[PDB]
Design a protein around this ligand. Structure first.
Ligand SMILES: C[C@H]1CN=C(Nc2ccc(F)cc2)S1
Length: 284
């Protein structure tokens, strides 16, 4: 059923809450035993948000291989994403270790360091050229190279150096800075513009490791980003673009990380983004 029509039918009937609860009821349930080990307590921002054992990212260290991160592998769309929580005080070094080991080109950040008067993430990138960061626990150095600040998002060029081997890589930091403290944006125009800038960079392309995407928990805004990308890619690839069922794509993605899309407002915003984005993907 054409999603634009399904959209007006849910809107006119005001059944967004009822659709959203059907998804929660049908969503996969897999074990998260490694996340709940006592040694990993301070590696988790939220007690109710864990990666599944089958899909979790492992750090390449014999000590403790655990990070709150999941590999979302979309077989038909031919896209992979890593979804992770905002780094914590004692996991900032683990975060950059994962970026290095998985050969990611881009980091996508959908939250501000402070929201609603509380800390949502650590300040994990350097804010000045001449003041670099050193992660002694993972033996990595990080340097700000340049910064381009626009109205709805900032792009930063960073250099990450493996102090063990002295290899260096360029990482792009895509920071969406205007998601509101409560609810969702009114229009998806600036979110879609942001997604096309990430795509244009080659950060989402198969010649690199998967893109690292995060908000505070790594399931809400993070969910919205990868659901919209995958849905628009599938509308490009298939003979019948109207066959693309956004609830089916979400349930497939929820086999890899729990809780993707946190509210009925976020589900509705996901529909709007795809519906609007398709008016470029279908030839405009
Ligand atoms: C000065 C940089 C190099 N090493 C660092 N560690 C750190 C990690 C998290 C945090 F919240 C505060 C500090 S930051």
């Amino acid at each position: 059923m054409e999603m634009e029509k399904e959209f007006e039918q849910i809107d006119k009937s005001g059944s967004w809450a009822a659709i959203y609860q059907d998804i929660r009821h049908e969503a996969s349930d897999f074990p998260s035993r490694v996340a709940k080990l006592p040694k990993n307590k301070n590696r988790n921002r939220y007690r109710d948000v864990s990666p599944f054992d089958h899909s979790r990212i492992k750090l390449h260290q014999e000590d403790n291989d655990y990070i709150n991160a999941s590999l979302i592998k979309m077989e038909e769309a031919q896209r992979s994403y890593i979804l992770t929580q905002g780094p914590l005080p004692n996991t900032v070094g683990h975060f950059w270790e994962m970026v290095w080991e998985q050969k990611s080109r881009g980091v996508v950040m959908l939250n501000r360091v402070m929201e609603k008067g509380s800390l949502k993430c650590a300040q994990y990138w350097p804010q000045k050229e001449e003041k670099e960061m050193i992660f002694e626990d993972t033996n990595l150095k990080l340097t700000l190279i340049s910064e381009d600040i626009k109205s709805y998002y900032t792009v930063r060029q960073l250099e990450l150096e493996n102090l063990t081997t002295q290899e260096t890589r360029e990482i792009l930091h895509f920071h969406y800075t205007t998601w509101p403290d409560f609810g969702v944006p009114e229009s998806p125009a600036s979110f879609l513009n942001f997604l096309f800038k990430v795509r244009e960079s080659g950060s989402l392309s198969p010649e690199h490791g998967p893109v690292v995407v995060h908000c505070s928990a790594g399931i809400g805004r993070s969910g919205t980003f990868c659901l919209a990308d995958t849905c628009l890619l599938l509308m490009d690839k298939r003979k019948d673009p109207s066959s693309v069922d956004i609830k089916k794509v979400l349930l497939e993605m929820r086999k890899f990380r729990m809780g993707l899309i946190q509210t009925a407002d976020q589900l509705r915003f996901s529909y709007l983004a795809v519906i609007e984005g398709a008016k470029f993907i279908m030839g405009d």
